[PDB]
Every structure is written in C-alpha cells, then in structure tokens.
Design an enzyme around this catalytic site. Structure first.
Site, short mmCIF file in Angstrom:
data_model
loop_
_atom_site.label_atom_id
_atom_site.label_comp_id
_atom_site.label_asym_id
_atom_site.label_seq_id
_atom_site.Cartn_x
_atom_site.Cartn_y
_atom_site.Cartn_z
N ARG A 1 45.68 37.49 9.84
CA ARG A 1 44.30 37.94 9.66
C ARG A 1 43.37 37.42 10.74
O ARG A 1 42.43 38.12 11.15
CB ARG A 1 43.77 37.55 8.27
CG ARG A 1 42.65 38.45 7.84
CD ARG A 1 41.81 37.93 6.70
NE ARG A 1 40.99 39.01 6.18
CZ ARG A 1 39.80 38.81 5.57
NH1 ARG A 1 39.29 37.61 5.43
NH2 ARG A 1 39.18 39.91 5.14
N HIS B 1 40.92 39.78 12.83
CA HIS B 1 39.48 39.66 12.80
C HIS B 1 38.90 39.28 14.15
O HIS B 1 37.76 39.65 14.47
CB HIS B 1 39.08 38.64 11.74
CG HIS B 1 38.89 39.30 10.42
ND1 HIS B 1 38.09 38.81 9.42
CD2 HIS B 1 39.38 40.45 9.93
CE1 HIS B 1 38.11 39.59 8.36
NE2 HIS B 1 38.88 40.62 8.65
N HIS C 1 48.60 44.07 4.53
CA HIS C 1 48.19 43.57 3.24
C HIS C 1 49.37 43.32 2.31
O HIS C 1 49.18 42.87 1.19
CB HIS C 1 47.18 44.51 2.56
CG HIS C 1 45.79 44.29 3.10
ND1 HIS C 1 44.72 45.07 2.69
CD2 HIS C 1 45.30 43.34 3.95
CE1 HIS C 1 43.63 44.60 3.33
NE2 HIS C 1 43.95 43.56 4.09
N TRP D 1 48.92 41.20 -3.15
CA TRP D 1 49.23 42.61 -3.19
C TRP D 1 50.68 42.85 -3.61
O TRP D 1 51.05 44.01 -3.92
CB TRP D 1 48.98 43.21 -1.84
CG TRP D 1 47.60 43.31 -1.34
CD1 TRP D 1 46.76 44.36 -1.52
CD2 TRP D 1 46.88 42.35 -0.58
NE1 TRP D 1 45.56 44.12 -0.92
CE2 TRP D 1 45.59 42.90 -0.33
CE3 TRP D 1 47.19 41.08 -0.08
CZ2 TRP D 1 44.62 42.22 0.39
CZ3 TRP D 1 46.22 40.42 0.65
CH2 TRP D 1 44.95 40.97 0.89
C1 HEM Z 1 39.59 48.59 5.62
C2 HEM Z 1 40.19 47.46 6.25
C3 HEM Z 1 40.41 46.18 5.64
C4 HEM Z 1 39.70 45.57 4.67
C5 HEM Z 1 38.43 45.99 3.96
C6 HEM Z 1 40.33 44.31 4.41
C7 HEM Z 1 39.91 43.37 3.50
C8 HEM Z 1 40.58 42.19 3.16
C9 HEM Z 1 40.10 41.24 2.19
C10 HEM Z 1 38.87 41.37 1.31
C11 HEM Z 1 41.00 40.21 2.24
C12 HEM Z 1 41.04 38.98 1.37
C13 HEM Z 1 40.37 37.81 2.11
C14 HEM Z 1 40.47 36.61 1.18
O1 HEM Z 1 39.89 36.63 0.06
O2 HEM Z 1 41.16 35.65 1.59
C15 HEM Z 1 42.01 40.50 3.21
C16 HEM Z 1 43.10 39.71 3.47
C17 HEM Z 1 44.01 39.98 4.50
N1 HEM Z 1 43.93 41.03 5.38
FE1 HEM Z 1 42.66 42.55 5.36
N2 HEM Z 1 41.42 44.13 5.25
C18 HEM Z 1 41.49 45.27 6.04
C19 HEM Z 1 42.34 45.47 7.09
C20 HEM Z 1 43.33 44.58 7.53
C21 HEM Z 1 44.14 44.76 8.71
C22 HEM Z 1 43.90 45.92 9.64
C23 HEM Z 1 44.95 43.67 8.79
C24 HEM Z 1 45.83 43.27 9.86
C25 HEM Z 1 46.67 44.17 10.51
C26 HEM Z 1 44.65 42.83 7.67
C27 HEM Z 1 45.33 41.67 7.35
C28 HEM Z 1 45.01 40.84 6.25
C29 HEM Z 1 45.79 39.70 5.83
C30 HEM Z 1 47.08 39.32 6.52
C31 HEM Z 1 45.18 39.17 4.75
C32 HEM Z 1 45.59 37.99 3.89
C33 HEM Z 1 44.88 36.74 4.39
C34 HEM Z 1 45.28 35.48 3.63
O3 HEM Z 1 46.18 35.49 2.76
O4 HEM Z 1 44.68 34.41 3.93
N3 HEM Z 1 43.62 43.38 6.89
N4 HEM Z 1 41.72 41.73 3.79
#
Ligand code: HEM
Length: 291
Positions: A45, A49, A172, A188
C-alpha cells in the site's frame, strides 16, 4: 514538469538486488506486525499511495520525488497507517543511503508482492528526490464509500483503464482494513499475506451483506468474516468490471500478468526513462536465491 530517471551513481542490478534482499529479509524477520500479517501488505500500500498521487494532466505527484517523507504527505489522512511501512524501511535506507526515497518506496512494494509469492514485477531505478514544495496536497487518493462510476473516473487521472483498475484492486487480497485507520474494519479474505486472486473469488462467491461497522460506515460483510469496501463491491455491480472480475477469478496466471503490468505502470507514471536507461530489473526472490 519532466522527471527524467537518473540512475543512482554507479549502481547496477546487483546493488538493487541487495536492497531487495534486505527488504525481503526484514519482511521475513519482522513477522509479528499486525497480528502476524507482517509488513507485506502495508508495503504494497505504501508503494501505491506514494505513486497514486500522480496527476497525468500536469505530472504532479507520482513516485518520482519520494515526497511521502515530507509531513504534508505522510500526514495525509488517506495515508493513516503507512508510517508503519516507512518505519520498516528506515533501517533499509540507513544501510543503503544511496537509494532514492521514491526508488525505495516503490521497491518495497515490488519486493513485498514477490516475497508474498505474487508475480514478478519488473522495476526500474532512477527516481530522484525532489524538494518539500513538490509534495502534492492531500486529497488525491481515492475514497472508499463510492460507486463504480467514481472508481472509473478516479483512475482515469492515473491513466488506468477498466482492466488495469480491476487488476490493481486485486491487491486487496492483502492485509486488512483497520477501523481506526480508514473507518473500515476486516480482512478481504483468508490468504492475506500470500498474493493470490482470492479477492475476485471472494467477491463472486461469498454471501455479502451490507452492514454498518462501528465507525457508522457501510461495508459488505460475509459470514466467513471477510469484508469488501463499497468501491470493491462496485466491481461486481458494474457489468464491465464484473466481466473482468470473473476473468481473474478464473485465471490466476492472467491476473498475475495483468497485475504485474499495471503495478509497474503505476509505479512508473510520471517518469521519463532515457533511451539508454537500463532495462527493467527482475529481482530474484530470497527463495530463488536460496536465502
Ligand atoms: C478505489 C481504490 C481504492 C480504495 C478506495 C482503497 C481503499 C483502501 C482502504 C480504505 C484500505 C484500508 C486502510 C486501513 O484501514 O488500513 C485499503 C487497504 C489496502 N489497499 Fe487499497 N484501496 C484502493 C486501491 C488500492 C490499490 C490500487 C492497491 C494497490 C495495488 C491497494 C492496496 C491496498 C493494500 C495492500 C491494503 C492493505 C493495507 C494494510 O493491510 O495495511 N489499494 N485500501
């Protein structure tokens, strides 16, 4: 503005494989983080970001300048929790002070995907740190409470099409939402530190219920204990996204290949690679090296 990739002086593939390896070894060692999820997901992430602030219209933001290191960006509410990925990388940067910040944040993501048994992601060096005033303002990363139209429009700014968006969202599978971070809670799926196409399978196959979490936000929940954000769920509400979700749920290799391309692209938006730049590097995993 044009951001030309500039190879860290004298460095070549072996230098970056050493950085890869140090990241990968720390990923293995520091296994307790996040209730034993480990740092893989938050490093993916972080890479996203730090890249996803890009605006194709004027080449602001993006991975090149490594601007997350400045307080406006590291304190973006959208980036809550990513400080853990940054702190992880700090000893790496201390050991290898020659690597640029953008190169390290993006390489962290590549290394995490690959060490989590994901596809190989070719990676190019040459990001150069840019000054504090080049840090993009907050608000360029996406909201999770929106629909497919939002998602599609959002990602046009990153020059991603439907296939690229659905592929990228497969990340995700990894990690989880954390209520105090994003206002969403839960993983997820089951395999959340191994890179697979589970995100698509769960979208199609779980029995989802629209519930409110303890932050009063709606999310989709299953009896297995999994969740989807509204933006995740939008991928099966929109018929164009749905087709692609089904494709990736039914072809792991296709998902791997498309993710790899899209993720490299994400990490490279905004960067101009000279004609005589090195070819992209494909790092060997620790496992492939016998380490
Ligand atoms: C419409 C696009 C997206 C939205 C709204 C979104 C939103 C989110 C949210 C709300 C979280 C949880 C953050 C937390 O509470 O720790 C998250 C986690 C994450 N997202 Fe996204 N995301 C999007 C796209 C992506 C993309 C494009 C990737 C990378 C290719 C990505 C990779 C991740 C990963 C790996 C996590 C887990 C982080 C952790 O476990 O600490 N996301 N995302």
């Amino acid at each position: 503005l044009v951001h030309v990739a500039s190879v860290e002086k004298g460095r070549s593939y072996e230098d970056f494989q050493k950085v890869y390896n140090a990241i990968a070894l720390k990923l293995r060692e520091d296994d307790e983080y996040d209730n034993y999820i480990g740092y893989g997901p938050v490093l993916v992430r972080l890479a996203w970001h730090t890249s996803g602030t890009w605006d194709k219209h004027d080449n602001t933001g993006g991975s090149y300048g490594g601007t997350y290191r400045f307080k406006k960006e590291f304190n973006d509410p959208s980036n809550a929790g990513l400080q853990n990925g940054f702190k992880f990388l700090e000893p790496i940067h201390k050991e290898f002070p020659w690597i640029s910040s953008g190169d390290l944040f993006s390489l962290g993501g590549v290394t995490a995907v690959q060490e989590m048994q994901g596809p190989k992601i070719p990676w190019r060096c040459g990001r150069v740190d840019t000054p504090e005033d080049t840090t993009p303002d907050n608000g360029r990363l996406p909201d999770a409470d929106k629909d497919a139209d939002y998602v599609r429009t959002f990602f046009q700014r990153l020059n991603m099409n439907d296939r690229e968006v659905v592929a990228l969202m497969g990340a995700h599978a990894l990690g989880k939402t954390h209520l105090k971070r994003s206002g969403y809670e839960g993983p997820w799926g089951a395999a959340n530190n191994v890179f697979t196409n589970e995100f698509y399978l769960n979208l199609l196959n779980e029995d989802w219920k629209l519930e409110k979490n303890d932050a009063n936000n709606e999310q989709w929940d299953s009896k297995s204990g999994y969740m989807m954000l509204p933006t995740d769920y939008s991928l099966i509400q929109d018929p164009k996204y749905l087709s692609i979700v089904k494709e990736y749920a039914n072809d792991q290799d296709k998902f791997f290949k498309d993710f790899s391309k899209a993720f490299e692209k994400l990490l490279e938006n905004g960067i101009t690679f000279p004609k005589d730049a090195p070819s992209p590097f494909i790092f060997k995993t620790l496992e492939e090296q016998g380490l």
